[PDB]
Subunit: 146 residues, 3 copies
């Protein structure tokens, strides 16, 4: 609970960001008069909608990776990346909402942040498994010698 | 294990609920003959589909908050909120499926439950970080006095 | 911290798999020239898109279940199901990409693996709660007897 509080903070922040995104769709729904069963309408609504939707489907990836990296590599490092990602995503949502062009730059930023997290989580897992593995590997070569 | 079992239960219940929503869409797909690559068709299907999709995208928000709140504030209180949310969501799904008007009321219900969870997670996190911060704050203004 | 390392590993693998599906959509987006605000186009694109979207919405269900089962029943068993599921999903994505028919077989495979995990998680939670409940139940029926 001590070594997880930073993670949980970034997590809650992320949830708030997602809640913001979905509030913006609800607003763009009134603004551009697009009725609830409808997913489609004026391009400015559609861009806002699609941004929220792209952000929503990546969220679980962010969460999973945040925690895995935070626990197996470094809480502080993971939390910082999470922050960078979350911020990049806000920029993505806003760029996309303007033009389908202005989402590209922030998307790449967020992709890097997320890849970094994946990289950390990967090392942290290797650091965990590789020693135990190499030990069991060498034990195989020692049983032969004796 | 003992301090998270109630959370895990509500989590599993939520998973089941989502599984239900999913099965309903598969049903309404046969019922209204809407073939797999198509996301669109009769209003009856689209409402069912969109309800599941709305429920699906909030689910990680619910999970994230449920656990952060459960762990940092109170397992029982979080778990009870989760239950309230999950029920409200079931109502939302069924209301929406009838008319895009009948989803509104339960949506608000679910939004409240989810916001409360966010609030609890927020308090719990403040309670964790605040004293240690006030300690360091006093240490500063105490450097002055001494 | 390490009675969860296998879980964390299957989790990260899952994230990578989703990262893969997302990249595949990005690719099919250029390949069939479908501009970003648009969700719709040639059936070849739509199938790839829909696959990624179906995979993405079940992902949180997978994660939630994987961890709850892994923690309350057995880490190795959960992780193995996770692996089966993940692989089944890869096959789903690929089949769906070719034809909306070739998705069905792997979908069922994935559905089994996922239900199995739900089953394990359910038992594990029963094993935790059910002793105490049946005991209180017998006590009640025993208070009557004596
Ligand atoms: C942290 C969790 C919170 C996540 C965010 C979810 C918050 C939920 C709050 C619900 C607010 C929605 O508010 C509601 O929106 C719907 C569409 O979206 C509007 O639309 C509604 O009224 C219009 C009238 O113009 C009808 O034509 C339409 O069929 C009906 O759906 C309502 O006028 C508005 O009252
Ligand atoms: C919703 C509010 C979000 C607040 C999120 C908090 C961000 C905190 C990031 C911490 C910065 C990381 O810095 C790390 O800190 C830990 C704390 O012991 C130590 C490490 O040596 C250091 O590298
Ligand atoms: C470099 C390769 C050397 C291999 C030796 C590693 C020994 O592996 C050690 O196993 C014990 C189990 O009792 C635990 C430690 O966390 C782990 O590091
Ligand atoms: C510990 C609790 C376990 C909960 C696990 C969660 C799994 C979810 C399963 C709950 C199913 C909900 O139960 C649902 O009730 C409604 C009643 O309005 C029924 O509603 C049905 O009949 C009515 C007519 O009476 C129709 O208007 C409606 O279109 C139709 O769906 C559904 O047939 C049933 O599926
Ligand atoms: C910094 C601390 C973070 C923890 C916050 C915990 C909040 C718990 C209290 C729950 C009440 C929140 O209630 C919610 O408030 C926000 C205010 O931004 C409203 O949101 C409204 O303002 C924002 C401006 O930022 C608009 O983008 C949005 O379109 C609009 O609807 C929601 O319509 C309302 O439902
Ligand atoms: C302006 C008015 C604002 C009002 C705000 C009110 C503050 C709300 C904060 C409540 C959250 C406190 O979070 C509290 O954390 C402690 C951690 O020590 C938990 O305590 C738990 O773990 C500790 C170990 O440290 C055990 O000793 C204890 O048996 C157990 O219950 C409490 O279950 C939880 O209630
Ligand atoms: C929680 C998991 C929910 C996953 C949702 C996916 C549902 C898949 C639809 C199942 C329909 C049953 O389809 C049938 O399955 C059985 C056993 O599985 C086999 C048959 O060849 C197949 O025709
Ligand atoms: C707490 C509940 C846990 C149940 C555990 C059972 C797991 C074994 C799998 C069988 C579940 C049967 O679930 C059934 O699936 C088929 C095919 O997908 C459809 C039905 O609508 C659904 O009711
Ligand atoms: C998958 C099936 C799971 C069903 C679980 C059913 C839940 C049963 C409710 C049990 C509630 C007990 O709540 C208990 O409260 C006491 C208060 O002194 C404390 C314990 O940590 C907590 O476990
Ligand atoms: C009853 C159904 C059988 C499923 C039980 C499986 C869970 O078995 C669990 O093992 C772990 C590992 O030491 C411990 C738990 O206390 C125990 O409940
Ligand atoms: N769901 C995404 C998968 C790939 C992706 O994240 N694409 C990025 C870069 S093209 C995007 O901005 N998607 C636009 C959107 O989803 O609306 C999609 O359909 O495009
Ligand atoms: N994805 C949602 C984001 C905002 C939201 O959650 N909207 C609520 C209130 S308008 C809703 O019931 N959406 C209808 C739907 O998603 O089909 C949407 O497109 O509407
Ligand atoms: N979101 C799903 C919910 C139900 C589901 O998972 N359907 C399966 C079996 S029909 C599927 O492969 N859906 C195709 C898709 O989502 O593109 C849908 O709309 O179909």
């Amino acid at each position: 609970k001590d070594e997880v509080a930073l993670l949980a903070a970034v997590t809650l922040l992320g949830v708030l960001l997602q809640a913001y995104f979905s509030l913006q769709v609800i607003s763009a729904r009134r603004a551009f008069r697009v009725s609830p069963p409808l997913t489609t309408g004026p391009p400015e609504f559609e861009r806002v909608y699609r941004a929220q939707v792209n952000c929503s489907e990546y969220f679980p990836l962010f969460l999973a990776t945040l925690w895995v990296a935070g626990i197996f590599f470094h809480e502080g490092a993971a939390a910082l990346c999470g922050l960078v990602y979350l911020f990049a995503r806000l920029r993505y949502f806003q760029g996309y909402a303007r033009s389908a062009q202005l989402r590209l730059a922030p998307l790449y930023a967020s992709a890097r942040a997320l890849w970094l997290l994946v990289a950390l989580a990967a090392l942290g897992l290797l650091a965990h498994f590789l020693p135990a593995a190499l030990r069991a590997a060498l034990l195989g070569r020692l049983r032969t010698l004796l």
